[PDB]
């Protein structure tokens, strides 16, 4: 009557199809990027659009915990059990996250509505940013050429 797309199965596509990944994501996103104007305690916001995305893997969007030698417990999961209103968090134990992905389900189709990624983390003065954008687009080509 509805038969909605599955929080598992939609993800399997998301991690293995580049154009589909992009076709699922809003433009712009509700998280403008926000960095420091090379002055310390200064506020700034950037338009989040398709041209500054970072593609994401199955070992990015998994539900589990990992171990580095030199960090600690890294977690990745959805934190929120809802039938249509789930979102995703990755980060270490006892610490803040750095990969945030809001998901929403309308019309029986999932659509990603927000983003957080360390590719435009706080340690990134706006002066260098337009090169950071282009660098993520290097890695993105190497993904999407091989993620059909």
Q: At 38, which CATH number?
A: 3.10.450.410
3-state secondary structure of 19: helix
Phi and psi at residue 105, to the nearest 5° = -125, 110
Please state, as a whole number, how many other Cβ atoms lie within 10 Å of the Cβ of residue 70.
4
**Could you tell me the CA-to-CA distances from 94 to 10, 50, 78, 89, 122 in Å, in that order?**
30, 32, 17, 13, 20
Residues spanned by the domain of 87: 1-148
Across 95-118, b (16+ Cβ under 10 Å) vs e yields eeeebbbbbbbeeeebebbbbbbe
CA distances from 66 to 7, 79, 88, 90, 101 (A): 21, 16, 16, 11, 19
Q: Is 40 left (phi over 0), alpha (psi -120 to 50) or beta?
A: left
What technique determined this structure? Answer: NMR
Contacts of 58 by beta carbon, 8 Å cutoff, 6+ apart: 15, 16
Distance between start and end Cα atoms, the chain:
31
Count of domains forming the chain: 1
Give the C-alpha distances (Å, rounded to integers) separating 142 from 18, 98, 132, 137, 147.
11, 23, 16, 9, 9
Query: Whole-angstrom Cα distance, residue 102 to residue 33?
Result: 15
């Amino acid at each position: 009557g509805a038969e909605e797309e599955d929080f598992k199965t939609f993800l399997q596509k998301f991690t293995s199809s580049a154009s589909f990944q992009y076709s699922r994501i809003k433009f712009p996103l509700k998280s403008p990027i926000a960095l420091l104007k090379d002055d310390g305690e200064t506020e700034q916001t950037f338009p989040f659009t398709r041209e500054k995305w970072a593609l994401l893997d199955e070992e990015t969007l998994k539900e589990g915990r990992t171990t580095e030698e030199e960090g600690g417990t890294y977690i990745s999961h959805f934190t929120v059990n809802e039938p249509a209103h789930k979102e995703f968090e990755a980060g270490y134990d006892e610490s803040e996250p750095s990969l945030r992905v809001v998901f929403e389900l309308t019309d029986g189709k999932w659509y990603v509505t927000d983003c957080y990624n360390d590719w435009y983390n706080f340690d990134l003065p706006i002066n260098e940013l337009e090169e950071t954008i282009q660098a993520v687009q290097e890695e993105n080509k190497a993904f999407e050429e091989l993620h059909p």
